[PDB]
Design an enzyme around this catalytic site. Structure first.
Site, PDB file in Angstrom:
ATOM      1  N   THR A  37      -7.226  14.829 -12.324  1.00 54.81           N
ATOM      2  CA  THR A  37      -8.519  14.248 -12.651  1.00 54.81           C
ATOM      3  C   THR A  37      -8.383  12.754 -12.890  1.00 54.81           C
ATOM      4  O   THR A  37      -7.772  12.326 -13.865  1.00 54.81           O
ATOM      5  CB  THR A  37      -9.136  14.906 -13.895  1.00 54.81           C
ATOM      6  OG1 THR A  37      -9.196  16.324 -13.707  1.00 54.81           O
ATOM      7  CG2 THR A  37     -10.530  14.375 -14.151  1.00 54.81           C
ATOM      8  N   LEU A  38      -8.955  11.959 -11.988  1.00 52.94           N
ATOM      9  CA  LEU A  38      -8.919  10.513 -12.138  1.00 52.94           C
ATOM     10  C   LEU A  38     -10.010   9.992 -13.059  1.00 52.94           C
ATOM     11  O   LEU A  38      -9.892   8.872 -13.561  1.00 52.94           O
ATOM     12  CB  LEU A  38      -9.043   9.846 -10.768  1.00 52.94           C
ATOM     13  CG  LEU A  38      -8.006  10.280  -9.733  1.00 52.94           C
ATOM     14  CD1 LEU A  38      -8.299   9.633  -8.396  1.00 52.94           C
ATOM     15  CD2 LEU A  38      -6.604   9.942 -10.201  1.00 52.94           C
ATOM     16  N   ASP A  77     -12.233  19.932 -16.738  1.00 55.50           N
ATOM     17  CA  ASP A  77     -11.125  19.951 -17.684  1.00 55.50           C
ATOM     18  C   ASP A  77     -11.435  20.849 -18.871  1.00 55.50           C
ATOM     19  O   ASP A  77     -10.545  21.542 -19.384  1.00 55.50           O
ATOM     20  CB  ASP A  77     -10.815  18.530 -18.143  1.00 55.50           C
ATOM     21  CG  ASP A  77     -10.340  17.643 -17.016  1.00 55.50           C
ATOM     22  OD1 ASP A  77      -9.781  18.167 -16.034  1.00 55.50           O
ATOM     23  OD2 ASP A  77     -10.521  16.417 -17.110  1.00 55.50           O
ATOM     24  N   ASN A  79      -7.872  17.867  -7.477  1.00 50.79           N
ATOM     25  CA  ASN A  79      -9.048  17.014  -7.587  1.00 50.79           C
ATOM     26  C   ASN A  79      -8.703  15.532  -7.571  1.00 50.79           C
ATOM     27  O   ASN A  79      -9.610  14.706  -7.423  1.00 50.79           O
ATOM     28  CB  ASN A  79      -9.836  17.351  -8.855  1.00 50.79           C
ATOM     29  CG  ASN A  79      -8.996  17.273 -10.106  1.00 50.79           C
ATOM     30  OD1 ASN A  79      -7.820  16.933 -10.060  1.00 50.79           O
ATOM     31  ND2 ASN A  79      -9.602  17.595 -11.237  1.00 50.79           N
ATOM     32  N   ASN A  80      -7.430  15.168  -7.728  1.00 55.59           N
ATOM     33  CA  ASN A  80      -7.035  13.781  -7.525  1.00 55.59           C
ATOM     34  C   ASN A  80      -7.173  13.357  -6.070  1.00 55.59           C
ATOM     35  O   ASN A  80      -7.309  12.162  -5.796  1.00 55.59           O
ATOM     36  CB  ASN A  80      -5.594  13.567  -7.985  1.00 55.59           C
ATOM     37  CG  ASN A  80      -5.486  13.339  -9.474  1.00 55.59           C
ATOM     38  OD1 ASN A  80      -6.464  13.470 -10.205  1.00 55.59           O
ATOM     39  ND2 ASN A  80      -4.294  12.995  -9.934  1.00 55.59           N
TER      40      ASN A  80
END
Ligand SMILES: */C(=C\S(C)(=O)=O)[C@H](Cc1c[nH]c2ccccc12)NC(=O)[C@H](CC(C)C)NC(=O)[C@H](Cc1c[nH]c2ccccc12)NC(=O)CN1CCOCC1
Ligand SMILES: */C(=C\S(C)(=O)=O)[C@H](Cc1c[nH]c2ccccc12)NC(=O)[C@H](CC(C)C)NC(=O)[C@H](Cc1c[nH]c2ccccc12)NC(=O)CN1CCOCC1
Lengths: 256, 195, 221, 211, 211, 241, 215, 241
Positions: A1-2, A59, H133-134
């Site tokens: 997750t960025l 998340d 998901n990156n």
């Protein structure tokens, strides 16, 4: 997750004479777009523990699944009610998770509240645990639980963690936190706690663009974990100068 | 880099500079003469930096001071000269900066022998000893240690010899050719030193 | 900073904290953030202190010049126009968030002005780093047609919330009540923070304890 | 910031009973760690009752001092009177803000006496501190400025004593300055302390550390 | 920091200052920049204090195990090689280390300069730290191999004093140790440079010294 | 932010939300985004508040100048001399809840002798915005009535272009969510009640779906002879499903 | 099109330490903050390692908590293995190893290790998040260190005072620490609320509490 | 791109546009964005074509594995034993214009003995998307029928979160324009004809307003016993006004 894409706004948890009251609006926003209006942001870990989140829904769901399986393993190994994990134990687990992910620089974009009852001396709910049937939904009085037997804990993105008599995330951490530091008191009744939380949620609805007035309340008490019927908070403006027509102001100048 | 050194006594001022004219990785001249600007009335501006900025600023200051002295039929004081130089450098700092370090030496009856230290940022102050360049790091302590009041011109020149030996031995750029300007007994003398 | 303002019946009440901060360090413990523009107009400032002070002084003197020339009562709308035009001219580089309150022929008026040059006419507002805590208090407790005393109490509560919940806010609470015929500037109004521990006796250095190199004495005539 | 670290320097001002004091460090630096002078005073006299302590970039200090001297001299020759301390403080604020978007890198303090006439005249201590764009803090006990601001603030919070004679005021201000300087790499190399009294000025150089 | 070492007719003279700093803030004035690696080897450290201390302790552990296994004392050259190889393995990670290892072994008095970049220079006179240039100038202007012990100690003390005076990053106390065939002595445990200044440069103490 | 304009059979109706937000914080709960330029001319603002407000102030100044210069010399119209009402109280009624929510005024210039033209004001605004489109970023909807073209809507778009709309105009972040709803529900020659309901519903849907849209709803109805203004506070969206 | 995440935050705090002939003092403020907000007004920064040793840290709260827990675990394992409690010097070396293990991603924590050794002498170690220095008299870490250290230098070393004072005792030292923390609270926005003061001496560790400004 | 899913009284209807574009150029005029995972399970894809296609291939492989493992041993249902029509030709008729535009097939697994669950497939997809998901950036709508929860809609959002929708789901750039339209027009327990008309109109409006949506319209109707599929080519939007 960025980074966050689909997010939930603040959560508010407080202690009162019978246990924990935690509130969050059922909205998840995809930016400025309120795509989801009936989202669940408070989860039951076991009969004495709940988790609320503000931040990325993905998340939050990952953490919820982790905690669900941790609870299942605890239940598998349990022999007596004292063997069930406590809110403090789950708070430590989540704090360690966040710390390790910080060290890896792969964080969960979330602020977490872990709340519940830190004692087994008020009921026999954990003698026989039911996961797929809620007998609560046959009414006995609530038990006055000592404040020291209750637990609310906060974890943030950097792993910063602590506990208090009331915890807030998001914009609640400004509006509701001010109101709570002013007006919170020990051993509040259920109606008083709900009134305080409703004031906080109304201010949040008025001053926070990512919130709604569709509210979910969850009570952790001697009866166990109860989800209330979601309700629409009545939110009326507090001034008639807002409603005053613009054409009745002087037509010259920057009256807007 | 150009190393400048200045020493002020009760009876003298000595300025010293390396005599190298540098263009990239080659020395154009071992006897450069673009660093000292002698100004009528016992004044000297020793400049260090790029040759173009050095020439422009030095000649600008010298012509302005000479114009002042001709218009007023008088010698400009050393303090007035130093602060005029600093004011011009400061004025140009925020518009089109000259990247020059200055040692302003002079003599006048009002204040005797004077030495001023000025950097490319136009931070100035009167000093008894000063240095500019990467050789300042290697000569400043020698100046501090061997300087005393009532020093003579020859003792000052011995201190300068120590400084030149240090710059030849320990400085990355082995500098061996120096020019000295000595002001004392109301006369200005030029010396050339090789180590 | 926590500044705030509200409109009560026939008056405008402004409040401010008194802390100026230079990074994490308190540069001023009792700075004055409420400024007189005219007898019937005042402002409270947040943002860059130098910009706020210069802009408020300029507005005050221009308003006084206008009052002298027109021989009439100054107007909050005129102050708003001048301030917004200046701030827009500078494109938000004069960081001045102002709560401007005054009473004129149009009755009590409260404006929030932001550094880029936008303004809004409000019944109540709060600005600064403590603005969210002050706004929580104001949203919770504000109602129309409050008495001047009730408005003073509410402004004090809002500023105290800002002071005690924001790290960039502190000091005392200053209040100003502006009506059409007078202003009351109470400075300080609360004084809620004071140093809590003091040594049993102050440390007085014995004479001659500091070594000196030289001493020159000159007589002023 | 680094521009302030280039030279260093610190100024301090304290008030007593019918006296004030202004102290400064005497170093001039280069590249934040090279000491080129040990007699670069940062206190300038505007008139008998007004002193300004300027710390920061040395070129900006000199430029601001020249501007302030020009303005004060013109004002005083025109009015045939000494400039008031409050008037000088406001003028300094306006001058500093006149360069708002390309400022002088100087953090000044103003220390002096406000004169009140009744026969006799009353001298009231006056202290103000500034930031580089003219934001002004008017104070009754002590003002600090420079790279040693935190150390000076701590020392003055702990040690300042209200209503001290000139001797106690000198001891307190000198102790504050020396202790604050001992903890700064880029400030020190001598300390200059002026004690203003309505009838005389005492100038002292302190035996300080030179490392 | 100023650390220096030089060979002379009676052994090696090692000297250091005692100042630590973080940015422009003086964190301490009483740190120990000379350490003993073993009986006959002294290391003077400059740069990152934590890196220097950790890697000197590492080298000491390696030397202890080597000496235990081989029943012989390690040589300064071998210790310098070990340290330089270890430091080179970390090239490009941000280590800050300048170490002068001076000692006595079966080949006489030996002195090596070792860097975090993997350098290892054998020499007779070294100086490291932010005051290294000033110490170098002072040492070079008055160095001689036939100095007595007292003269050599005086030279080292003077060099450290001048480095502290000119450099803002050096100060505190000066320590001077003497390495000889049978070990090492601490001639100057620690001497404040305040007295050094007022004994070398301003003995009269009648006015502020003008640099 | 949501601003809408619709042309019905007898006038033009502008509507707007009232939320000004700095990101996710709501700086102004109930701002005023529909502003009067002249008695028969209104503008809805979208984009940066400072930009739109300062532009509108300049344009009001220009329109005062234009109206003054439009006046002719002498006397005129000597022998010549120049319906369904919205139940605003019923619209605003809420069970769980000196409030003024309706205003109405007639034009002083009955014959439109000197009132500036909607196209003129819109085009001067467009020129101002285009000359500084390197800095200014705002979108405006001019709604007005003049005796030449009757009721008009002009969209002044970001970057300073002008398009006259003959059915409806929308702008702001919230208009995207109601784009197809309005396209489906609009019809030619709507009655006043139909237009009012449609525009109110459009703003309500935009506020429901957009986080930057909220607060109350402001509506201005410009006709041949008067201007009405309404405030709606019953903005909650209730779905049966 | 996303912004990078910075893995460090400062949560404020001040920890002062002061030694004596046979005692040591460690005082710490209890406020926990994030930017201009307060997370909580009571987050202790001091942890007890042994009956004669404690550690106080300032910096990132999560790093401080993890480091204190890791040190406590190491000390308990040492007790179990080598059957005796480590003294402050062994604990200092242990903490140095722990801190340099993360040399290339350091703990964001500045720590003061205070204790009394076998000779009954107060000992302080100051850690700059990677390395250790033994402090002779006093130490300070955190946001108020630059305000406080000059005061303690003036009151303890008195290097710039010809007429010196030497009567140092536990009560006067405690008062000095209280004054220093109060003065820091005056001008430091990250120091305030409550402060915990631990005194370690022959009778053990005693904890007292002092109130500070809440703004 | 526009993908929609709606739940009506007797099944679930998915619909999509068919334009794949690389910026402003249309690389594929008529792409297939509704894809069959199992006989009773379909997915609508949005976002990067490569990401969604490769994910869907992996998920089809996983679903084959799951279906094989779901089969029990023996024989079952020995004694047990297990409609308004859309006028597709009329819907597609155009005056100015061997074409196949309709298909229908019955489930082989009549009793849903071994068919995987819609939630199971959606959640394995969500887990795959969240673990990467990156890199991966796609949004999916799973529409299906299983005997436990009947007709179901799941939205797998960007960043890999899963939300079950009980009324309808939308995704793609064009869904924004029809958000309020669908919210207004949707009702509980719609008939097949009502749902078909609503979803067709939603896709048509999205294509009208969105440059990234175009081509034909593909619709899949999943019920308890069969799946129907339609192609609509009469996609032009005609407005009276
Ligand atoms: C409110 C805080 S906030 C976070 O909401 O901005 C206060 C408002 C304030 C303070 N003082 C006054 C006086 C009159 C009206 C309003 C006032 N704002 C501040 O304190 C500023 C906040 C920062 C983030 C901008 N602080 C300042 O402007 C500093 C004041 C200052 C610094 N040193 C001083 C010495 C003496 C007197 C005052 C000060 N100044 C700076 O930060 C300097 N920068 C330099 C670069 O340009 C911008 C200003
Ligand atoms: C010499 C100076 S220099 C300019 O030549 O590098 C000294 C040598 C030195 C200092 N201390 C010791 C101890 C043992 C051996 C040698 C020693 N170097 C320094 O002082 C360092 C200079 C920087 C530019 C590299 N400074 C330090 O390493 C700091 C020491 C320190 C920090 N806090 C303290 C409290 C008490 C006593 C000492 C210290 N540490 C750092 O700067 C490391 N930072 C700290 C902040 O967070 C990031 C890491």
């Amino acid at each position: 997750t960025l980074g966050p894409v689909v997010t939930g706004t603040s959560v508010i948890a407080i202690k009162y004479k019978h246990g924990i009251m935690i509130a969050a609006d059922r909205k998840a926003s995809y930016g400025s777009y309120a795509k989801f209006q009936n989202v669940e942001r408070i989860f039951k870990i076991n009969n004495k523990t709940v988790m609320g989140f503000s931040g990325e829904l993905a998340d939050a769901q990952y953490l919820h699944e982790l905690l669900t399986r941790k609870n299942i393993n605890n239940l598998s190994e349990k022999k007596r009610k004292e063997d069930m994990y406590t809110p403090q134990h789950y708070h430590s687990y989540v704090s360690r998770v966040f710390y390790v992910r910080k060290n890896r620089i792969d964080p969960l974009f979330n602020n977490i509240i872990i709340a519940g009852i830190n004692s087994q001396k008020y009921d026999n709910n954990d003698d026989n645990v039911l996961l797929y049937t809620n007998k609560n939904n046959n009414n006995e009085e609530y038990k006055e639980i000592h404040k020291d037997d209750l637990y609310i804990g906060f974890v943030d993105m950097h792993g910063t963690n602590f506990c208090d008599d009331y915890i807030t995330t998001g914009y609640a951490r400004y509006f509701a936190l001010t109101l709570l530091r002013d007006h919170y008191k020990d051993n509040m009744t259920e109606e008083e706690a709900r009134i305080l939380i409703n004031e906080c949620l109304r201010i949040l609805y008025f001053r926070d663009a990512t919130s709604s007035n569709f509210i979910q309340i969850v009570k952790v008490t001697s009866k166990g974990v109860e989800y209330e019927e979601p309700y629409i908070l009545p939110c009326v403006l507090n001034s008639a100068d807002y409603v005053y027509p613009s054409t009745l102001l002087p037509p010259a100048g920057c009256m807007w | 880099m150009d190393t400048l050194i200045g020493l002020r006594g009760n009876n003298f001022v000595v300025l010293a500079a390396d005599t190298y004219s540098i263009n990239s990785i080659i020395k154009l001249k071992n006897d450069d003469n673009t660093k000292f600007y002698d100004i009528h009335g016992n004044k000297c501006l020793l400049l260090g930096g790029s040759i173009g900025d050095r020439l422009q600023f030095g000649e600008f200051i010298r012509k302005n001071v000479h114009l002042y002295q001709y218009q007023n039929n008088t010698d400009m004081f050393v303090k007035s000269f130093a602060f005029f130089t600093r004011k011009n450098l400061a004025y140009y700092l925020r518009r089109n900066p000259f990247e020059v370090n200055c040692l302003i030496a002079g003599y006048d009856k009002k204040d005797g022998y004077q030495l001023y230290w000025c950097d490319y940022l136009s931070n100035m102050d009167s000093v008894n000893k000063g240095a500019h360049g990467y050789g300042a790091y290697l000569v400043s302590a020698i100046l501090d240690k061997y300087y005393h009041e009532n020093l003579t011109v020859d003792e000052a020149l011995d201190i300068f010899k120590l400084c030149f030996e240090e710059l030849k031995k320990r400085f990355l750029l082995t500098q061996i050719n120096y020019e000295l300007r000595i002001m004392y007994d109301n006369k200005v003398e030029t010396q050339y030193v090789t180590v | 900073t926590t500044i705030c303002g509200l409109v009560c019946q026939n008056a405008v009440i402004l409040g401010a904290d008194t802390r100026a901060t230079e990074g994490p360090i308190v540069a001023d413990k009792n700075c004055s953030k409420l400024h007189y523009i005219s007898k019937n107009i005042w402002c409270a400032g947040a943002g860059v202190a130098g910009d706020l002070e210069h802009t408020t002084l300029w507005l005050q003197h221009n308003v006084e010049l206008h009052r002298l020339n027109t021989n009439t009562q100054p107007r909050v709308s005129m102050c708003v126009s001048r301030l917004t035009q200046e701030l827009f001219k500078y494109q938000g580089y004069k960081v001045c968030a102002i709560v401007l309150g005054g009473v004129d022929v149009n009755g009590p008026q409260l404006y929030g002005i932001h550094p880029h040059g936008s303004s809004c006419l409000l019944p109540f507002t709060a600005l600064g780093s403590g603005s969210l805590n002050a706004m929580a208090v104001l949203e919770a407790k504000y109602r129309d047609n409050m008495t001047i005393e009730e408005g003073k109490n509410l402004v004090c509560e809002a500023i105290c919330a800002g002071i005690f919940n924001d790290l960039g806010s502190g000091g005392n609470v200053d209040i100003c009540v502006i009506t059409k015929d007078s202003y009351q500037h109470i400075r300080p109004y609360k004084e809620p923070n004071m140093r809590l521990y003091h040594l049993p006796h102050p440390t007085i250095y014995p004479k001659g304890t500091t070594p000196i190199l030289s001493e020159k004495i000159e007589y002023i005539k | 910031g680094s521009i302030y670290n280039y030279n260093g320097g610190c100024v301090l001002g304290m008030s007593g009973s019918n006296c004030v004091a202004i102290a400064c460090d005497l170093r001039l630096g280069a590249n934040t760690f090279t000491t080129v002078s040990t007699k670069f005073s940062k206190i300038f006299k505007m008139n008998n009752n007004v002193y300004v302590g300027l710390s920061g970039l040395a070129t900006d200090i000199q430029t601001l001092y020249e501007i302030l001297r020009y303005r004060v001299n013109l004002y005083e020759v025109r009015q045939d009177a000494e400039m008031d301390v409050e008037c000088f403080a406001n003028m300094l604020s306006s001058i500093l803000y006149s360069n708002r978007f390309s400022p002088y890198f100087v953090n000044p303090i103003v220390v002096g006496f406000k004169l009140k006439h009744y026969k006799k005249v009353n001298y009231e201590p006056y202290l103000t501190a500034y930031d580089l764009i003219g934001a002004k803090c008017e104070t009754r006990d002590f003002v600090v400025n420079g790279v040693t601001s935190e150390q000076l603030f701590g020392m003055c919070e702990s040690l300042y004593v209200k209503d001290q004679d000139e001797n106690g005021l000198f001891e307190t201000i000198s102790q504050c300055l020396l202790s604050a300087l001992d903890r700064d790499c880029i400030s020190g190399w001598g300390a200059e302390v002026l004690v203003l009294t309505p009838e005389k000025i005492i100038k002292k150089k302190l035996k300080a550390r030179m490392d | 920091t100023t650390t220096l070492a030089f060979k002379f007719k009676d052994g090696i003279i090692v000297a250091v200052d005692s100042r630590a700093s973080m940015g422009s803030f003086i964190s301490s004035q009483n740190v120990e920049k000379i350490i003993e690696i073993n009986k006959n080897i002294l290391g003077t450290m400059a740069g990152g204090a934590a890196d220097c201390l950790y890697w000197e302790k590492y080298l000491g552990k390696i030397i202890k195990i080597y000496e235990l296994r081989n029943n012989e004392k390690i040589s300064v050259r071998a210790a310098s090689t070990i340290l330089s190889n270890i430091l080179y393995q970390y090239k490009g990670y941000g280590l800050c280390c300048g170490i002068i290892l001076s000692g006595y072994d079966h080949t006489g008095f030996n002195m090596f300069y070792v860097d975090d970049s993997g350098k290892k220079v054998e020499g007779n006179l070294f100086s490291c730290g932010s005051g290294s240039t000033y110490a170098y100038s002072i040492l070079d202007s008055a160095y001689d191999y036939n100095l007595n012990l007292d003269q050599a100690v005086e030279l080292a003390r003077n060099a450290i004093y001048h480095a502290t005076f000119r450099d803002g990053g050096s100060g505190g106390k000066v320590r001077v140790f003497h390495i000889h065939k049978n070990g090492y002595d601490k001639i100057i445990e620690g001497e404040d440079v305040f007295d050094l200044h007022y004994h070398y440069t301003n003995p009269e103490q009648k006015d502020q010294y003008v640099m | 932010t949501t601003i809408i304009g619709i042309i019905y059979d007898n006038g033009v109706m502008l509507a707007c939300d009232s939320r000004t937000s700095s990101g996710t914080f709501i700086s102004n709960k109930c701002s005023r985004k529909i502003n009067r330029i002249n008695e028969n001319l209104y503008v809805c603002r979208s984009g940066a508040s400072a930009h739109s407000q300062k532009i509108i102030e300049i344009i009001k100044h220009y329109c005062v100048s234009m109206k003054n210069e439009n006046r002719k010399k002498g006397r005129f119209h000597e022998g010549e001399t120049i319906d369904e009402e919205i139940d605003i109280d019923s619209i605003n009624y809420l069970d769980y809840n000196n409030l003024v929510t309706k205003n109405k005024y007639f034009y002083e210039d009955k014959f439109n002798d000197y009132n500036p033209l909607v196209e003129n004001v819109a085009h001067i605004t467009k020129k101002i915005i285009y000359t500084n489109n390197n800095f200014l970023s705002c979108a405006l909807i001019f709604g007005g009535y003049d005796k030449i073209k009757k009721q008009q809507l002009y969209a002044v778009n970001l970057n300073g272009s002008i398009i006259e709309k003959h059915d409806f105009a929308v702008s702001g972040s919230g208009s995207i969510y109601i784009q197809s709803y309005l396209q489906d529900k609009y019809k030619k020659f709507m009655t006043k009640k139909e237009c009012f309901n449609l525009i109110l519903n459009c703003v309500k849907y935009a506020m429901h779906n957009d986080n930057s849209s909220g607060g109350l709803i402001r509506i201005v109805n410009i006709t041949k002879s008067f201007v009405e203004e309404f405030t709606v506070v019953n903005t909650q969206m209730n779905f049966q499903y | 099109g996303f912004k990078r995440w910075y893995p460090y935050i400062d949560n404020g705090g001040t920890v002062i330490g002061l030694t004596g002939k046979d005692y040591v003092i460690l005082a710490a403020d209890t406020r926990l903050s994030l930017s201009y907000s307060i997370y909580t007004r009571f987050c202790p920064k001091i942890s007890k390692l042994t009956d004669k040793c404690i550690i106080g840290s300032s910096g990132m709260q999560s790093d401080i908590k993890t480091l204190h827990s890791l040190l406590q675990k190491k000390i308990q394992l040492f007790v179990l293995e080598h059957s005796h409690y480590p003294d402050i010097h062994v604990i200092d070396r242990l903490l140095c190893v722990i801190l340099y293990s993360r040399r290339f991603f350091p703990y964001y924590a500045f720590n003061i290790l205070a204790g009394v050794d076998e000779n009954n002498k107060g000992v302080l170690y100051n850690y700059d998040s990677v390395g250790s220095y033994c402090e002779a008299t006093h130490s300070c870490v955190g946001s108020g260190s630059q305000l406080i250290l000059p005061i303690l230098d003036n009151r303890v070393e008195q290097k710039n005072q010809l007429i010196k004072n030497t009567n140092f005792n536990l009560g006067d030292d405690i008062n000095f620490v209280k004054d220093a923390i109060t003065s820091a609270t005056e001008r430091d926005i990250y120091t305030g609320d409550k402060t915990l003061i631990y005194v370690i001496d022959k009778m053990g560790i005693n904890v007292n509490t002092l109130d500070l400004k809440q703004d």
